Inverse folding.
C-alpha cells in the first residue's frame, strides 16, 4: 500500500461536465503537421520507410540542418476554414493538433524559441487560425505537445552529470513557459496530450509531471490531461506504483486496441485510442505504397470497437507541406462522414453496454439505455446471436435507419436470435434494441 508524493490524484472517472463532453465527443481527428511534411519521408534522394515525422532520426540529420526547413515553410494552400469544414463533414467532434512535435518547430509564435512559424516565410499563427476555425464549427481543440525537443540543446535523454542536471532544469522551465503560453494564448483548449515523455530524464523527474498537470489545471478550468505525461516518485509511467491511473484518461492504445473479451478492465477508466491510416505514418509521407493502408470500413470498425469498450478514438491526418490534404485522406474523411451521418447515434455519447461480445460486431449503450448492435460480419445463418446479462430481456429490435421492426426469437434462457434485415444493408449497420431490466 505504498506512499507517494507524485502518484494519482483522481478517485474514479471524473464526472464534471468538461470530462463528460470529452467523453461524449467520442470521435476525434489527429493532425500531425510540422517541418517533416516538407521532405515527406525522403532525404537527400533516399525514401525512408519509417514514420515520416521521425525522418530527422532515420536520416541522421543534425538540428541546424533540419530546422533550415523553416526557410521553405510556406503552405500557400492552407485555409483553416477548409480544414474545419473537412473535420465537420467527417463527423469529428474534436481535433488534437501537434503544437510542437519532437523536432521542436512550434506552430504558434512562441516567445521562448526562434523555431516557430513566425520566422518562416508564411509568418502567420497557424495554431491560432486553427483554434478559431475549429471552434467556429463547434469542434473542441486539444493540444498535442512533445516534451522531448530535438531543437533545444538543453534537452537531456538522461541525467548523467551536474552539467546535465543544470541544463535539464532549464529545459523544464522552458517547457513550463511554453505550456503557460499555450494555455493563456488559446484559453478554449480542452486538453493537453503529452508525448515524448519516455526518456529517463523524465522518468527521473516525476515531480515535474505532476506539477505540469496541476499547473495546467489551474490555468484552464476543466482541462483534461493524458496519462502519458505522468510518472510517479518511483518512475512508473501512466499508472503509479499502486497501479492507480495518473492523469485524467489512459492514452496507451496507440495503433492498437484492447481485446473485447480479455481487457474489460479498461471500462473502469476513461481512455482514448489513436490510430493511423497506413501502418505507421503520422506526419505526411509521400509514398503510401510502402505499408498497408486501411480502408474506411477498417477504420470505422476500430472507432466502434473503441466506443464499445468505453473509449474515444482519434484518427490521424498528416497534411501536405502546401497546407492541403492528400486524396486518400479526403476520401477517408468523406467515407467516415457518410457512415457517421447515418449511424452516429450508436457512437456519439455512447458507452460500454455490459453484454458478452459476439462475432457479428459490437454493442454500444446510449444515454437512455438504448443498446445498439453494430454489425460488421453478416452471418449466413441470418441470425445475430444476443446473449443478455442476468436480469435483462430484449423487448424489441429496430433497424436504426428505417425504423422497420426486426424479429427477435428467444432461443434459451438469456439468449436470442435477432434476425438480419429483410434487405441486406450492404454496409456495416445498426440494429437498435429496447431492453428491460428486472427490479
Amino acid at each position: 500500500e505504498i506512499p507517494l508524493k507524485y502518484g494519482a490524484t483522481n478517485e474514479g472517472k471524473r464526472q464534471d461536465p468538461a470530462m463528460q463532453k470529452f467523453r461524449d465527443n467520442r470521435l476525434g481527428a489527429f493532425i500531425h503537421w510540422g517541418l517533416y511534411a516538407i521532405p515527406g519521408g525522403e532525404w537527400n534522394g533516399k525514401v525512408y520507410g519509417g514514420a515520416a515525422e521521425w525522418l530527422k532520426s532515420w536520416a541522421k540529420v543534425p538540428a541546424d540542418e533540419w530546422l533550415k526547413l523553416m526557410d521553405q515553410w510556406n503552405p500557400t494552400k492552407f485555409d483553416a476554414k477548409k480544414w474545419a469544414k473537412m473535420a465537420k463533414e467527417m463527423g469529428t467532434k474534436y481535433v488534437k493538433i501537434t503544437t510542437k512535435h519532437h523536432e521542436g518547430f512550434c506552430l504558434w509564435p512562441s516567445k521562448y524559441t526562434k523555431y516557430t512559424v513566425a520566422n518562416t516565410p508564411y509568418k502567420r499563427d497557424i495554431l491560432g487560425e486553427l483554434v478559431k476555425a475549429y471552434n467556429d464549427e463547434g469542434i473542441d481543440v486539444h493540444f498535442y505537445f512533445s516534451v522531448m525537443d530535438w531543437s533545444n540543446p538543453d534537452y537531456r535523454y538522461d541525467i548523467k552529470s551536474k552539467e546535465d542536471s543544470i541544463a535539464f532544469s532549464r529545459f523544464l522551465e522552458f517547457t513550463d513557459n511554453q505550456l503557460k503560453e499555450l494555455a493563456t494564448r488559446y484559453p478554449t483548449v480542452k486538453d493537453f496530450w503529452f508525448d515524448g515523455t519516455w526518456d529517463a530524464s523524465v522518468k527521473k523527474n516525476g515531480w515535474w509531471t505532476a506539477h505540469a498537470e496541476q499547473m495546467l489545471k489551474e490555468l484552464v478550468p476543466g482541462v483534461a490531461i493524458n496519462s502519458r505525461l505522468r510518472a510517479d516518485d518511483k518512475g512508473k509511467r501512466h499508472f503509479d506504483s499502486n497501479g492507480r491511473l495518473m492523469g485524467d484518461y489512459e492514452s496507451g492504445y496507440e495503433r492498437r486496441l484492447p481485446d473485447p473479451v480479455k481487457d474489460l478492465k479498461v471500462t473502469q477508466w476513461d481512455w482514448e485510442a489513436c490510430m493511423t491510416i497506413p501502418e505507421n505514418q503520422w506526419g505526411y509521407h509521400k509514398d503510401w505504397s510502402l505499408s498497408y493502408v486501411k480502408t474506411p470500413i477498417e477504420v470505422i470498425d476500430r472507432i466502434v470497437h473503441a466506443v464499445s469498450m468505453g473509449g474515444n478514438m482519434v484518427v490521424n491526418f498528416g497534411p501536405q507541406a502546401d497546407g492541403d490534404f492528400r486524396p486518400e485522406e479526403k476520401a477517408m474523411a468523406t467515407a467516415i462522414g457518410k457512415w457517421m451521418n447515418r449511424y452516429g447515434k450508436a457512437v456519439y455519447a455512447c458507452d460500454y453496454a455490459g453484454f458478452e461480445k459476439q462475432d457479428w460486431g459490437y454493442y454500444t449503450r446510449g444515454k437512455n439505455d438504448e443498446v445498439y448492435m453494430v454489425v460488421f460480419n453478416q452471418p449466413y445463418s441470418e441470425r445475430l446471436i444476443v446473449k443478455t446479462p442476468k436480469g435483462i430481456t430484449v423487448e424489441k429490435a429496430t433497424l436504426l435507419t428505417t425504423g422497420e421492426d426486426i424479429t427477435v426469437v428467444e432461443t434459451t434462457r438469456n439468449e436470442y436470435n435477432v434476425s438480419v434485415p429483410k434487405k441486406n444493408p450492404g454496409e456495416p449497420y445498426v440494429i437498435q434494441l429496447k431492453v428491460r431490466a428486472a427490479k
